[PDB]
Design a binder for this molecule. Structure first.
Ligand SMILES: Nc1nc2c(ncn2[C@@H]2O[C@H](COP(=O)(O)OP(=O)(O)NP(=O)(O)O)[C@@H](O)[C@H]2O)c(=O)[nH]1
Ligand SMILES: [Mg+2]
Length: 166
């Protein structure tokens, strides 16, 4: 069966791990257990396709940008995560995207943009700003909350759709 190699990137604490764990383990981690790196997989169904989703959950905590390089090479698709309550994380997106394009030596890498933490009243990034940012990338935008699981499958699964149509 098709294995899809998803990698989760984005600034420190936007909810990369929470998204992955909600996807994989169906529980809200509810803890900044700052990541070093973690590999997960789950057999899932996407558009009727039973497939495997491998998720490489990466340390956004930008002290390991050089660890990220070698490790991202492996990924086929990338979830670019910010938190809708952290504009600095939204600005940080350009960097992660650029690095990924660098690493894969391609302007057109399967990717999605993810605004996480949409349960939070504290929105500082408009949905339309992120939709526009994704559009400027020619990639999907998904809004999620790892807390409530709202949009979580959508984020990883829409990235599978990117990998496929690539
Ligand atoms: N309310 C809410 N909180 C969230 C959400 N996602 C993550 N959090 C919380 O915010 C904190 C940071 O989440 P985490 O998943 O560790 O961030 P990260 O991007 O994986 N961290 P790093 O790059 O260092 O590994 C945790 O307390 C976590 O429970 C969300 O969708 N909603
Ligand atoms: Mg993490």
């Amino acid at each position: 069966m098709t294995e899809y190699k998803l990698v989760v990137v984005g600034a420190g604490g936007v909810g990369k791990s929470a998204l992955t764990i909600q996807l994989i383990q169906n529980h809200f981690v509810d803890e900044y257990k700052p990541t070093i790196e973690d590999s997960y997989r789950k057999q899932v169904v996407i558009d009727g396709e039973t497939c495997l989703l491998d998720i490489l959950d990466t340390a956004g905590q930008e002290e390991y940008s050089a660890m990220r390089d070698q490790y991202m090479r492996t990924g086929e698709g990338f979830l670019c995560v910010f938190a809708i309550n952290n504009t600095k994380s939204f600005e940080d997106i350009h960097q992660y995207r650029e690095q990924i394009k660098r690493v894969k030596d391609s302007d057109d890498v399967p990717m999605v943009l993810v605004g996480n933490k949409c349960d939070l009243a504290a929105r500082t990034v408009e949905s339309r700003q992120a939709q526009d940012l994704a559009r400027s990338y020619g990639i999907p935008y998904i809004e999620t909350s790892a807390k409530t699981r709202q949009g979580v499958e959508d984020a990883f699964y829409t990235l599978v759709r990117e990998i496929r149509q690539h």
